[PDB]
Amino acid sequence: ETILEVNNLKTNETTPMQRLCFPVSVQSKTGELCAAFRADPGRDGPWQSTILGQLCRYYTQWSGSLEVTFMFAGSFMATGKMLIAYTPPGGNVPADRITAMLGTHVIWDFGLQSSVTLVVPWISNTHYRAHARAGYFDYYTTGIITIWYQTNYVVPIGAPTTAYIVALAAAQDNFTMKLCKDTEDIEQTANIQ
Amino acid sequence: HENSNSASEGSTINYTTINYYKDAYAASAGRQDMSQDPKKFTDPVMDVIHEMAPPLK
Amino acid sequence: DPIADMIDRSLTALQVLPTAANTEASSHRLGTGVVPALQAAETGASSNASDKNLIETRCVLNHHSTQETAIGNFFSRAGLVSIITMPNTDGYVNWDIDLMGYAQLRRKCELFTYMRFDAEFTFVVAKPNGVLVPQLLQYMYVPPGAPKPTSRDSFAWQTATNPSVFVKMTDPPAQVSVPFMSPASAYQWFYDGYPTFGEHLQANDLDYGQCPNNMMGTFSIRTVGTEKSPHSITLRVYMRIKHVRAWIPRPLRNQPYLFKTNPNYKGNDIKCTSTSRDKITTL
Amino acid sequence: ETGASSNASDKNLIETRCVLNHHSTQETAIGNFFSRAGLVSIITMP
Amino acid sequence: SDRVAQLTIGNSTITTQEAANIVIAYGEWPEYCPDTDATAVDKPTRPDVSVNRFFTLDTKSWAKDSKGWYWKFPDVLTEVGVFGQNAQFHYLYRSGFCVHVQCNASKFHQGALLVAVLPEYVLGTIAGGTGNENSHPPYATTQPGQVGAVLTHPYVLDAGIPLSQLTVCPHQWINLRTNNCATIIVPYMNTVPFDSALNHCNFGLLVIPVVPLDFNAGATSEIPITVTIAPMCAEFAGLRQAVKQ
Amino acid sequence: SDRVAQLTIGNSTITTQEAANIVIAYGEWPEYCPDTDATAVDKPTRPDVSVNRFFTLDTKSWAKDSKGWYWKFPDVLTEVGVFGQNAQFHYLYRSGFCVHVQCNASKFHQGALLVAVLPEYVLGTIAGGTGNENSHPPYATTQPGQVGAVLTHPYVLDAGIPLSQLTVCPHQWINLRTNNCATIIVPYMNTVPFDSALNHCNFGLLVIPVVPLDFNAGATSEIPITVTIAPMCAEFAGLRQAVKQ
């Protein structure tokens, strides 16, 4: 597992140490969503920062299941429950929680064990998948992963009201690749030395 | 041996192919099989029709 | 077994036929009830009447082989698929891999619906008048998703991962072998539907019939040197087809082609399938 | 926190069917990843 | 003694007294996907009663100068019944079919219909008449729904292939002097074991009148045609919220 | 070592780290209807994956002076998911349930919830205040849907029976100093083996705050309550066109 860059905003380009943690705070309403991203390991976005996302760029077609591990990094007295859902393609990001709970989902509880693993199972029509992209190759898309407030984030007096969550990503044992090609993340415009 | 990777491996063709490399799709075509099944295109019918009897009685 | 409800065929198998079937002898026949000459084409089965059930025949042992009618011998012939010219003017071309640009090979491959094969590519290259000039060339295959070269001296020409050939004009023509590389189990030449989800409108109407299991990236050639070569180049690409397996035959096209991506035809001159004659009684 | 990766499979979170896959891992070996000729030098004699 | 027939599946039953034989397309029965060819890991759902039954579509009118009609599958069933709901709440489906076409007339009429199932029926245009436009068919033409669309140039099937050799596909005849129905059983034919039901259409069903309908004046001049279909071994996988198209 | 728990069914999974034990109502697991007790002759349909999964309802807000809430079953699930579709296209259903209620707070709050499942919860009125009117509850009160309604006189449960002996029904406690969840498994309890889902409601789920929620000023004053349920062994029969109510 390596760290996933979920919080890749346009304002975090001059202070890029904050892109590894995304915040969770006390809400007044119920059922808000905290983050959402695509589950394409080959497309640009949050998966480009992984050792899996950099090794998939040297190939073209991949198969198998993934896993995403979240780890809570708040205080000890703080608590709460989160809902992490994975929606197969066909629909957009769900507008509310009661739409998003229809896909594969896991309810997370904070406590002593501060890590949960949402496994993203391999559901596709073809045996392999190419690298998804806008155009015709979005036929090989794989879904949308969101995350919702199951309950509120409850904190007592004297402990801070804002915590952070780091996200880790890896592959399962039935993962495989084929058809080696070159990456496009590196370049050589000027001559080295 | 060779890491077998061809287009026809499940139901294949005759065993006279020549190859000098390590990948099986580099091999020649060779001579082909004489196998054929006509009746799944000329007689796709559930109840069997005999040539002597009337077919619609 | 508390629930008695929960506890709870192929037609013909293939065989080898090396030669055509013989003809057995027969005689006349007079009888009632048995009739092989009368059929019923309404059931969709073809007739099974032979020669001996209508006339009297002798015995003929024939040894006519059926080897040339196999699908392996029908397809394993190199045909032209592309003409690529470098007058483009900057010493390099990027050609998208589409094997439906010439009608003689397109008609043969569209006879079947699904196909699964390995290819063998051959490049024959000369000047536009057949003249020969000593010259160094480079071919590079770019898979879909890989960066493409934008100039004659880009960093994509280093070929650290990409398969590539270096060959001269005076040499014998280059030959390579390509395996079956689709994400699906077989290539298909017809795809009834849209590749993407969402709303289909008049702006996205050209998506109909484009299957991404057949788009295989691009192909790039260049002259090797960093300067401008003074000669015009013309490449011809020939493709053989090996280890063929096919499925679900189709009717053949009798109208001339118009584009590479859709089966559109000309709507004014609908060509009749047979050549017309004058009268029905006189041949 | 212990630095070990998780060992949860697919079958421990959802219900799965039985799938026999024959996907080979040949292309991911280090021998096939590196045995490709790449450019290392351009040397000119003006 | 084989001119009568009865097909029952689900809670429905079709009976006929002047029927031809039953056609199994390419001699294969439809079946559930085995484990050796499966790629999805989620456990599939099988409703197995509420979707394996006979569904009856609308009724066309055979005139004296009709061209022909076509229906795209399984676009015809995606808005009706619980099969219209399982195909909206899932991502993958897999099913066979069983097509039954009824058209009956008396002993004083004449005509002949050619029914045929054609897989991967990709339509085309007339390319702007003169042939220089890269025209494309609209969404209402390619996927008409449970109504079905009519043909414009039936001699080329609106796809550039002639009618004269359409019988290489599985097919039957409805000749008005012998029988009144035709029936085909189609298995699942695709390059992938599962597929989406809203972006892919497997086959097309074509009903083309070869011999024109003719009668003397005074008879019943209203000849209808009614199509009835039924899925066979339907499976579904990949649950997600409802998306219609 | 029994304070942690994990429940998985369908494509959903519920985890908890401070949990009490699991309550099986009257010590019986839910099961399919055997042949000795069946009366319907049609073959039932079992979707068995798409309806046996955890469904999450809306989220209420626990204030300092709340009365209590109730949900009617299976009226809460009859408009959501494919279970909302099979209960609209059929005449008979039969299913168990598994209720899971989450409500979490920190170590500086206090309060106690009494969760209880009560079968045949027939509501009443206050009979016009003075007791001479034969009043009746409206349709919006008796079957609120997936939102749920609040209680007015919780001491008599709006049905004339006192709260003080509600624990004879299967029940659990959510005490804010020990645990944060409660879970009951309910089998199918009715006089007939199948029933309609639009005219009959089997049981009611009641969440009543016995000890009021109290905290010092400055803490998180927003305490939510979220209910999550899942059918167990759902069967359906008697297919007919869609009727919502």
Ligand SMILES: CCCCCCCCCCCCC/C=C/[C@H](O)[C@H](N)CO
């Ligand atoms: C150094 C070798 C360079 C040559 C690389 C050739 C690889 C590409 C082979 C493609 C095989 C056929 C795939 C699809 C063919 C047709 O273009 C599509 N079906 C278009 O409809």
